[PDB]
């Protein structure tokens, strides 16, 4: 038993809810919140801008030190940093950005990072301003992630379409 409430069960291990990933993290304080990162960990908009704003920019300060030391992530890759006031840890995962021409086949590699963590609160990778089809992103999630993932879909209209079209 865990602290997640109000989720619809899609599979043995995947759950979904219409919720803002920021408000959900603040309420649950999960072990792991996933950020929809880019390779530079420049948290400007969407999940990353919203998560970073909720940390009063501490996520960005930590991220800049990480990049100064390690260089950029790979598309499909991840790093574990602090969760600040939102979670124990933040798993920053880079899905391909369709609006930059990145290979959508890298979405499966991106979701494979989630398997290193027993439970996660996450957004749909490569959705929203990353330009991928969210229905596709949910299918890859279900077919790739084997650990317990609690998906927060911000858009109510999209949430209803994801549920009603789910195979």
Ligand X SMILES: CC(=O)Nc1ccc(C(=O)O)cc1
Return residues touching ligand X (CB under 6 A): 20-22, 46-47, 50, 123, 127-128, 154
CB of 124 to ligand X, least distance (A): 6
Show Cβ contacts of residue 160 under 8 Å, excluding neighbours closer than 6 positions: 18
Tokens of 39: 């390779």
Based on CB atoms, which residue is closest to ligand X, 22 or 106? 22
Based on CB atoms, which residue is closest to ligand X, 12 or 130? 130
Based on CB atoms, which residue is closest to ligand X, 30 or 70? 30
C-alpha–C-alpha distance, residues 1 and 136, integer Å: 29
Strands in 32-36's sheet, in edge-to-edge order, are: 8-9, 14-18, 148-153, 119-122, 32-36, 89-93, 78-82
Give residue number: closest CB to ligand X.
128
CB of 45 to ligand X, least distance (A): 7
Strand 32-36 and strand 89-93: pairing? parallel
Based on CB atoms, which residue is closest to ligand X, 54 or 73? 54
CB of 103 to ligand X, least distance (A): 20
């Amino acid at each position: 038993v865990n602290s997640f409430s109000g989720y619809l069960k899609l599979t043995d291990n995947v759950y979904i809810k219409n919720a803002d990933i920021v408000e959900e993290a603040k309420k649950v304080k999960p072990t792991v919140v996933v950020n929809a990162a880019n390779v530079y960990l420049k948290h400007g908009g969407g999940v990353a801008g919203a998560l970073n704003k909720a940390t009063n920019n501490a996520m960005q300060v930590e991220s800049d030190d990480y990049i100064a030391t390690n260089g950029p992530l790979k598309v499909g890759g991840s790093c574990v940093l602090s969760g600040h006031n939102l979670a124990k840890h933040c798993l920053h995962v880079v899905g391909p950005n369709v609006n930059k021409g990145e290979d959508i086949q890298l979405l499966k590699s991106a979701y494979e990072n989630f398997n290193q963590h027993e439970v996660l609160l996450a957004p749909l990778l490569s959705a929203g301003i990353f330009g991928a089809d969210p229905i596709h992103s949910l299918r890859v999630c279900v077919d790739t992630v084997r650990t317990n993932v609690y998906l927060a879909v911000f858009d109510k209209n999209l949430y209803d379409k994801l549920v009603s079209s789910f195979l």
